[PDB]
Write a protein that binds this ligand. Sequence first.
Ligand code: NA
Ligand code: NA
Ligand code: NA
Lengths: 166, 166
Amino acid sequence: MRTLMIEPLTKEAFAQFGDVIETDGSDHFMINNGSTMRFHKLATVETAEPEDKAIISIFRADAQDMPLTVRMLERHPLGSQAFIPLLGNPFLIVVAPVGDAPVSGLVRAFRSNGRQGVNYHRGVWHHPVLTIEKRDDFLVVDRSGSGNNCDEHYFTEEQMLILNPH
Amino acid sequence: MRTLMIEPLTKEAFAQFGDVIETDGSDHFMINNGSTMRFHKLATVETAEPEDKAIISIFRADAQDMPLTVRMLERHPLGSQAFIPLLGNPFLIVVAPVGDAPVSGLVRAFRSNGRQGVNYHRGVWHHPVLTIEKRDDFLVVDRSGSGNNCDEHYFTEEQMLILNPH
Ligand code: NA
Ligand code: NA
Ligand code: NA
């Protein structure tokens, strides 16, 4: 068992897991006759087949008791999944690199500053949304289609991680 | 010139133009051990070709001078386009039903309560983002691909409309 280090979310640090949806440090160009800044293609929705559809949902999640014992992680082998804060609240993210099974020693914890969303690449292991506030709203963009799009992996007792935010 | 009636945004009134992305009055089911409410598939991203990709961007738009003279509308013939407020600010929406050209007499104006986003269906005529605050941020989900995905139609002088929120 080991305690996760809560790292500030950044494009460079999160690169192996997906994309960071934010305006800070992001490229853009002008549109609407120069009245709007378009921070273009911060993330791309990936699907297994072109027949698949990208859908938009809203998740209203309640906080989990902390410290949290990370007992499992899930992945979507057939599509990406994006979470974007709607209320400006910071939130937590737990992920592990792609692989047949998430490697406990490679698990990472990130903290969004409230103005950052994330898009988990297809196959990336991650924990169900972890809010900091008692209740929070997230805009979610993911894949809709046939087949298996959710693998769950439960760590052994010794492989469990501890998330202790302060 | 006709002065537009600013109507409150609702699913039923906006149905001809697209979907309203909100939790109020929307269906949902529980996930994550009953800790999260999933307001499922509030909108579906539609594309024209299988090679097309759904992308996520952020628009930082400046307010337009009011009263505003509506003299054009745009449409995306190859895909849908969704706008979701990120700062919880209400905003204005101007649309017209599908057709070779936007019909002035059918143009409608809506006002989001700040907790509502909108997804313009493919082919629906709409006006470039109209913020109420001096500056505002929106999460945008739309189609990315080859071809022409933007038709801008300018109204004649007598077809122009007036948007006067004050
Ligand atoms: Na505690
Ligand atoms: Na997931
Ligand atoms: Na399976």
